[PDB]
Amino acid sequence: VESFASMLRHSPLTQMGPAKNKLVIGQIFHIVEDDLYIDFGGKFHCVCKRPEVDGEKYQKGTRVRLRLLDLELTSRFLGATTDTTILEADAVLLGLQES
Amino acid sequence: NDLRDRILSEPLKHADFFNLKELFSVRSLFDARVHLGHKAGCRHRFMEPYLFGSRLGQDIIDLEQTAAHLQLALNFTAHVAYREGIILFVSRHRQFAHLIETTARDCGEYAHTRYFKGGLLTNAPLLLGPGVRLPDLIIFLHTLNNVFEPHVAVRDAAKMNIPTVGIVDTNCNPALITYPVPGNDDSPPAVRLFCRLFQVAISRAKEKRRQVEALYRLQG
Amino acid sequence: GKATERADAFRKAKNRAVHYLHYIERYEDHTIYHDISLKFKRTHIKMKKQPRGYGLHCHRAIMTICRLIGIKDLYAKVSGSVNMLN
Amino acid sequence: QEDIDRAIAYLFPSGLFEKRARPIMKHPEEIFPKQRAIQWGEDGRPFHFLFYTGKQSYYSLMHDTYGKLLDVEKHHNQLRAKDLLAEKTKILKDPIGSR
Amino acid sequence: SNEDLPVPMENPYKEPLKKCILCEKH
Amino acid sequence: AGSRLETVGSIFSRTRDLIRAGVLKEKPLWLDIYNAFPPLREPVFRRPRLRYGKAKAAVQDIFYHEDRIRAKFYSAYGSGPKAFDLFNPNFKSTCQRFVEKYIELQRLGETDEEKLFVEAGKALLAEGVTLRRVG
């Protein structure tokens, strides 16, 4: 049998380290008239704006390239006991699976 | 009437009566992003014993205790589904509500993914009907509502003495949940894994109940 | 139970008291297991375990509550506030 | 019915200004309102799977509408992936007068 | 007994603190 | 009827002592399953008190020895050329190949960090990958 610590030490999210400026392949799973819900795969889904070039090539299921900025947007404010989680991630759109 | 008690007393003498160990494993829970929780500042105080550590701000839920709790949760839900118990899948989350309705429909159990009314469980003989049978089990696929506060049914079940199985994240409160399962409830595959596990558990329970009744009809 | 009429409040309290039922562990069904000294919001209650011959030497309402519970022997002293609800 | 009300108006000629106060004899399904059907069997188990939502008819209608919306979405995604356009705009019902 | 357990070490990804425009000046 | 007190105890105790007193004439169907397979922690109510003073959490940070080399890789080259594929369970990135070369160059009897770093940086060219040193 395999231990959870042994699989977590060799999990790719452990190999990524800090989620700042990391190139991740994420797949789109939902489509809004202007917003694309891309699933980079870590915990949450990042919502990006459809670019002007090759805008029609972005469909449900398309895999794209992202530059991860934050794994989960949380911050504290005046008189808060816990953080205010946004249930989303921060990443920018660069391309669509260049190959 | 004497042999009817045999049907109810048989599965209580075995640990894995429905053979649920083959349904999942630690590696089957790892690839579904179940071991991932919220950030360190969003950690509830009652989540510290259920955590493995903190991987650069994000808390990591251990999967050994996750599976150890999930085995008991699946066994309990399979036994209550075997004993002809009403099971209600409750979740206030506007992403998988349709998945939970379809899972409860395929299970033949009942679902609540909409706005939970005030006196639903407490004021049931006025909210539902003159004489209504309350659910014998409440399975929580999202403990917190859209306001990030504990659900109403997680307290109304404890008020009405109803057993509650619940998937708790790093920002949830398992103090009142009877069977907590420390895992992830925000990733689509993590939700789908729990929904399919409870689906197969209720299916196997009802099927083994029908087989036991088939042999009950041949014992006399 | 609170209502405009006194009989209506009586009924609202009778039919509502059964929903909140405690179970009091009674040592030998006549006393409590040990002497308890509790401090509520502003009420101090000091109750002491007594033998079979010390029958309900408590406050006039604590005697009624213990007579409803089943405690036949008890000594209780209420200090501080004597608010009935607390 | 046009003879029933005509015979009632002659046999019981009530002169009243409110039309609902006059004597009327119709089929019981227009007089009595729509009564709710039974919701649970003899064993207590409810029939519909949305009975514990308070509005088991409205929420079931919403669930069916969303299930057909997702079916249309997946079928149109597969049709766009296969590059076929056989549907038309069947929403403009102005000359019909639909509301 | 486990070798893949995390060790209590310092943070290697510690980003250096930002300096003022006159940090280490006169 | 029952006991609607959530803060007094757990549902199992509140359902057991009621039948023990004789007010609950009918035993619930889940009580046998609770007696047969009880959970790990009894579901008693606990108030989430805040943590004041010098008291802190009891959790620990997750850090391995490979992170000390991953920090050097992300400080020198940044992100690797092969983008991260989190869907693949057995995905091996360039930083993982770098630390796989580092753990063996450590076993080869080398102690100096420069002799353990630039030699792995040159050994990565043997496979045919590119490294972009961020100036």
Add this chain to the structure above:
RNA sequence: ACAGGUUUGG
């Protein structure tokens, strides 16, 4: 002290 009455629209 086994306590009770009494401040106030409450």
